[model samples]
Target chain A: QTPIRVLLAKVGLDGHDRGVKVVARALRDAGMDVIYSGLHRTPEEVVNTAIQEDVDVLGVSLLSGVQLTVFPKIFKLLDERGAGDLIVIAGGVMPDEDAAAIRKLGVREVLLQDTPPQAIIDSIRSLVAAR
Target chain B: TWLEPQIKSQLQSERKDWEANEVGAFLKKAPERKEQFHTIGDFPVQRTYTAADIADTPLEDIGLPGRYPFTRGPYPTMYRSRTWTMRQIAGFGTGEDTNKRFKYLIAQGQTGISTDFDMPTLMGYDSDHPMSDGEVGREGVAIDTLADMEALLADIDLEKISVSFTINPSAWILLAMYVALGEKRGYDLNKLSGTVQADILKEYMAQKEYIYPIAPSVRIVRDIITYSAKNLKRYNPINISGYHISEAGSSPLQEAAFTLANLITYVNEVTKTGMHVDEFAPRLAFFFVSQGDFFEEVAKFRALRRCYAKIMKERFGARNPESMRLRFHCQTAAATLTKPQYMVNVVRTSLQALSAVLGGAQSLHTNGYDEAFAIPTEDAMKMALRTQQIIAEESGVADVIDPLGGSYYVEALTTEYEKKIFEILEEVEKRGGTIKLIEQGWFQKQIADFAYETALRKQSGQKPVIGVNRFVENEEDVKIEIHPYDNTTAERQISRTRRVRAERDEAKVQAMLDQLVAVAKDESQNLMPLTIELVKAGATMGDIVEKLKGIWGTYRE
Candidate 1:
């Protein structure tokens, strides 16, 4: 492959975009084609963007404690759109129980703010390889 | 000149001698922390500042307290007259749920009341709206009707305690609701003191909580200013904010400059309403964040006060001294708090709060140490409150006005910040002003660039953030009690909204909604009067906001 295509999305009303933008640039600089679905996006729009862009990975970042509510909808939409095989990840300011629930709901990774930039890049690399 | 010519020359000579003798020997024996030292904004710091540093600054530039170019403090005696209002923002779950927290904070000696709305309420959605699902009462309290507002402020005397609502895009609706409540309670509108975070420009710039497009959004802000200028004499309609901008990763200088730029935009908008600048300008307020850089934050506060005084007088042609004075509310930086070694956050907050006091804040909010996780628990909120209390009562820092006024480094840094802030303002003008620059995404790009650079520095350990990037802790299961999220909050809130709708007369609400649309079409009409009437008639926030959405549409991007 020429490059691993990645799509970063912010779902719902949580507008904390600093981390998403940082991850977007980090992925781009690490030799990946990255597309950012901007703020105030819904799960439907995110899945539609992923299918249109043909992204290899979908990373959704949330901060307003809506992960338990938003992530299930995202997975369902991904499956319905025939993009179920896409490697989906999550990030932002959720507690451990929520992250655990998200992982059980089929997220490949959950990168919180504490994750270093290189560690994030490395995690994406390994996720795509495993895929 | 700030210093006498002979004294400046003597200090200049002594500085050269000390650098050669003291610095040369010290550098040979022991190196400094880094090759270069700079503030968080990247202004280079020197080994030490002398009288030579500020010798060129005119003494008039650093005038006395309550004077023009208020470099020292806004008031003459500052905190000696009265201490800053301790406003700890509290909200979570239904309105009743937050009312308990409000009373708890007041019992704990918090002087003012602040309300934080949940995301759905903030975005103008009803509690039962699909977008509101799972988000009701999560980040803050949820209110959908005047009944909810009544419950939120239950038993809190509006005349005695000032209230501030941290709401944006839908700010006018909340203000309208407050007015409706005051009318129902027979409270004098003029006696009510508080602020609504009606600064929508910064929402598009940083906080990202906008609902309407640029033109209509700004129209709503103008409506609030003009309406409140006539009715609510003691209330601030808008707290032109730099706090969220800083939290979204701006340097102190950007925060100051961009806030003033927004202030200028709003003032021009209101003046376009044929109101004199002095009529609403006296109540124009500000909110800023006190970040980690100690002296830089202090200098930023001073520089902004000086810069704002000049901008009001020079740019707006205002003659009233009250119109020219700058007042601000400060919060310690939430961006700097860390999840790891979370207890250390208390120390960081204490120091930042100290800087804010030294910088002459009129009111302050200290972030809880546990904020990096969720809403702060009660214990954490108490600790945050105690931090402010200690600074006010024990530190003795508040006993003096502008305690660091004559310090060479602070004075020089204040001047430097003033110069840089004006340069940015000029740059904004060159780029076709704030709105045009915002349209072109210039300010957003600048913020994104600085944020990315700071991320890289933090990753490289070049910018040490104590427990985050440095001083790594090996313990894995570091546990601290956090604010618990109640799953029943949404159900309770949604049920209350349903009951409100069920009990109200739908015909009157619909007719009022149609009239609101008609009035919205005529841009000359202020929406507050009708909005207050609509809320009094039992129309929910979603009814008003969603109805108006059909008229102006929503803002995207």
Candidate 2:
């Protein structure tokens, strides 16, 4: 079986790459093939990269409180490209209601700041396995 | 100069005797803990330090408090005069929401107010902007006009209580509105004291919220400093921050070095505005973080003050002692907060806050426990405030100024950090100073390398972070309050922005914006004057930002 190919990215004006970098390494250690999209990425850039990378999962992190603006734009691009089935994840220090809004907009999972590295791996594995 | 060279040699002989008699005896029976002990910055930690370590460091270098170089302390009285201002940082939802929080904090005995703006506001957007969809009023207060600013400080006397704004990029716009508020409310402009986080270089390096490219952005900062020096004598024009830089995964050395380099850059620019170093330097302020490494953090603070004093007096040749004095506010480390045993954050914050106090911070903010999870709830915010109060009242930590001033280990480390800081500054200078380095992403690369190295250390168990990669807890579930985001906030704020646009004199606003446009084209014109006019004419925050964006264009990373 192919390893879980995950792309972790930061989109929009948020520069919080601390947790994202850590999470990226954790996934790589967990035997997932990971490509990290570095800080200050736009949704267009992220979506384009995710498609080019052809990763199994698109994990986006936002600490700047713009997921609502960001996710739909990414999702819209994903929708246009017929990549709706590609699992998407959102992480950072966002409130429950804000997280739920983006999740409703097709983010497969919502990961908060405290979500352990192992749980993230297990989530990626199980979600991929189920798919 | 030593006044105690005999004790240093005597102390050194005693260490050799102990190694032979005591350490050898214990080591024959039992193995010691692992060989190397290092700070998070990877600086070596000896088993003990003595007079020998700091023997050559003259007393003149570590003079008494309120003296030159200020290694012992920054002020004569220090906390004995008054303990560091217990400023609580807050912002969320609408202006009304933050206003309530402000009153709540003031009621709970918080001495000063510091604000955090939402992503939209921080990036200079109104709530109605397409990019502000899920962002408005999410992480901080959504402010789009003078109205929001007015509501955020409703009933609070700016004359008495100091306010610190934590926004960048759009800080000039916000500060302009603040001056507008004072102008309308009849508060003496001379008496209104506060700060704006107008450090644009750090945004390019760390925060990623900048609007213009490097050169113009710094020009805006220059405008801010010169304008405030001429008008708002009491208000701090720029905070010259390293807090965000540290939180973005910098080493303590990197934080101090970057902050100092940026400070030098700003000082040079303001001088180019025909302002003398002493004229604007005294009004300049700083912000830094208190992270987990206890002694390293303290040494960093002491070294920062010492190095700043030298740079101000020797490099800039400032005549006033006040210009050389580096006044700073320290926030307990947010990057140190972890999840799982979320309650552990309280202890972490308490420890860091104490370190800040012991290091002689002028003001401090103890971070909320649930910060890793969400914006702080009222209970969590109060608990943070209480942590500072406990340190001030019960802990006896600040009873004396620079209690660790003379400790051989601390003084040695302080001197060591001073050397390390200057080395980094030289490297930055070699790279053509801060603006060039920021443009070339030198800071980004250096900090990323340090962050990655630290992660490797923690994971390898060479360095242990409590409850993370060590003392691992499995299946631990914790229930914590998440600061509620009222969904109605965005709609209401957007409507207010629209209504403001409708009610405001459109012709006057257009005229003010036109003047701004004209002045922006002519490099000789100051942007601050036109900015104050635009805000006074009821231009929305986005209006002014977009106007400038029209000229400067949005900075693309």
By lDDT, the best candidate is 1
**Tens digits of lDDT, candidate 2, B417-489:** 9999999999998879888888788898887777766666665766667777767788435567777779899
Q: Per-candidate RMSD vs. true structure?
A: 1.2, 2.8
Task: Look at candidate 1 and tell me the lDDT of residue B342.
Answer: 92
Tell me the docking grade of candidate 1: high
TM-score of each model, in listed order: 0.98, 0.93
Q: Give lDDT: candidate 1, residue B91.
A: 92
- The local lDDT score (0 to 100) that residue B336 gets in candidate 2 is 83
Residue pairs of candidate 1 with colliding backbone atoms: none
- Predicted model 1 interface RMSD: 1.0
CAPRI-wise, candidate 2 is acceptable
Complex DockQ per candidate: 0.80, 0.44
Off by over 4 Å in 2: A1-6, A22-45, A65-77, A93-131, B3-6, B474-477
Which residue runs does candidate 1 get wrong by more than 4 Å? none
Error of 2 at B202 (Å): 0.9
